[PDB]
């Protein structure tokens, strides 16, 4: 009467299309997801921004159905539909009542496999894309992260923005989008996954009915394999000063670990060691992180967050600081980098606490069916399998303090960094003084 977590099945449709389901018996809703392993990296210098334009144009009509025949096919039956794109994969997912999914699957297949892009549609969507680009500049986090990505892998396709240059937006034609469809939408590089109340057999039948005509790619590769030259991490700095901003956002990062690197969970554990903080948190004074205590006591900032973004053949590992005490920015940066460098001599209680926290937080962020479906899709897209919780527990258990020390010595100790600052950054010192704090001199 205790029940157990339901395992995820997996099957291939004689075409490379992998389907993964996590059946929920007593569920009233459901989610169906369709992802492709082709983000904004496959673009070139000419046809950049074609991925976002292509995603924007998906729900504007097909050969069979036109616009206002899709909304009336979705709004009538009560079925939400949404999509978004990333730097390495693009996704589509539609959730509806238990009884409405078997038609949402068909409509999604009709939208994906078959499509029709008209010059009028492009000339209509150009202004929408331009408005979106003009709006996106206001947000600090997106600007900071885009600048950090551009200044880290400069000269590489991984260093571009997903939206693309404003010049390219008003120059794309239908032929480039059709070429993108013909090239990067193949059965070997596609995936469907459901995490609701739809049975695995029913999903298999629907997939065979509405997807058994795709053509596998000529380059028969695996899932998530690198495609191109390995980008070179180039330490640099970007300062977009603006004296009217009350705050000052700063992001500092080093080279991280790829998805297939054998030191992934160690980097995650160290990220958990550093943790995150916020001045509005109820338990702010009582946090068990040295950085949190030193920041809170002197009120050096408003918040900070540690991230471990990872790609197929590279990644980033750093911190994102938001502060309002203009004048003590150098102290904040120095203390942050000092705590970064201190990980070479980390104790054994800190490692165990971080391991427990990471084990708890890894499988605690999946509550809605959409989140579970997205996690399944991403995990199958990048690596190629969805690791069972037993495997995750075993991999986390192997971590000891000496592995943390080795990784911190081979990655963080006196290594190049890539920074990016936005706002009132007059008090932020230059590059050499910033870098000098990442390696302690006492030892």
């Amino acid at each position: 009467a205790t029940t157990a977590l339901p395992k995820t099945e997996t099957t291939t449709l004689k075409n490379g299309l992998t389907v993964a389901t996590e059946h929920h018996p007593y569920a009233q809703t459901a989610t169906v997801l369709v992802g492709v392993d082709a983000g904004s990296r496959a673009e070139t210098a000419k046809n950049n921004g074609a991925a976002h334009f292509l995603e924007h144009l998906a729900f504007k009509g097909t050969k069979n159905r036109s616009q206002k025949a899709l909304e009336l096919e979705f709004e009538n039956t009560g079925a939400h539909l949404n999509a978004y794109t990333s730097r390495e994969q693009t996704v589509y997912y539609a959730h509806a009542f238990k009884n409405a999914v078997p038609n949402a699957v068909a409509v999604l297949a009709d939208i994906l496999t078959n499509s029709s892009i008209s010059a009028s549609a492009v000339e209509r969507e150009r202004q929408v894309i331009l408005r979106e680009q003009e709006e996106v500049d206001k947000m600090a986090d997106e600007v900071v992260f885009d600048h950090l990505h551009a200044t880290a892998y400069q000269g590489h396709p991984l260093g571009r923005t997903i939206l693309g240059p404003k010049e390219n937006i008003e120059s794309l034609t239908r032929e480039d989008l059709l070429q993108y469809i013909k090239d990067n939408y193949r059965s070997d590089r596609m995936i469907i996954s459901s995490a609701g109340s739809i049975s695995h057999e029913e999903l298999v039948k629907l997939a065979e009915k509405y997807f058994g005509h795709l053509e596998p790619s000529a380059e028969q590769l695996s899932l998530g394999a690198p495609r191109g030259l390995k980008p070179r991490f180039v330490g640099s700095e970007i300062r977009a000063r603006d004296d009217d901003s009350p705050t000052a956002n700063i992001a500092i990062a080093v080279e991280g670990m790829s998805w297939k690197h054998p030191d992934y969970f160690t980097a995650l554990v160290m990220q958990a060691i550093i943790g995150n903080w916020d001045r509005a948190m109820g338990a702010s004074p009582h946090l068990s992180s040295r950085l949190s205590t030193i920041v809170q006591q002197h009120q050096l900032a408003n918040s900070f967050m540690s991230f471990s973004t990872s790609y197929s053949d590279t990644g980033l590992w750093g911190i994102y600081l938001v502060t309002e005490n203009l004048g003590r920015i150098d102290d904040l940066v120095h203390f942050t980098l000092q705590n970064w460098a201190r990980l070479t001599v980390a104790t054994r209680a800190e490692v165990e606490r971080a391991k427990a926290q990471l084990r708890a937080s890894l499988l605690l962020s999946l509550d809605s069916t959409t989140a579970i479906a997205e996690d399944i899709g991403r995990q199958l897209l990048t690596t190629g399998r969805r690791m069972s919780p037993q495997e995750v527990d075993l991999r986390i258990g192997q971590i000891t303090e000496k592995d943390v020390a080795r990784v911190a010595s081979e990655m963080i100790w006196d290594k190049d960094i890539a920074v990016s600052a936005v706002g009132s950054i007059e008090g932020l010192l230059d590059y050499n003084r910033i870098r000098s704090s990442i390696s302690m001199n006492r030892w």
Partner: peptide, 11 residues
Amino acid sequence: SPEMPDFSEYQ
């Protein structure tokens, strides 16, 4: 916003 200036000469 412009593109990244070419730093390949000094690299």
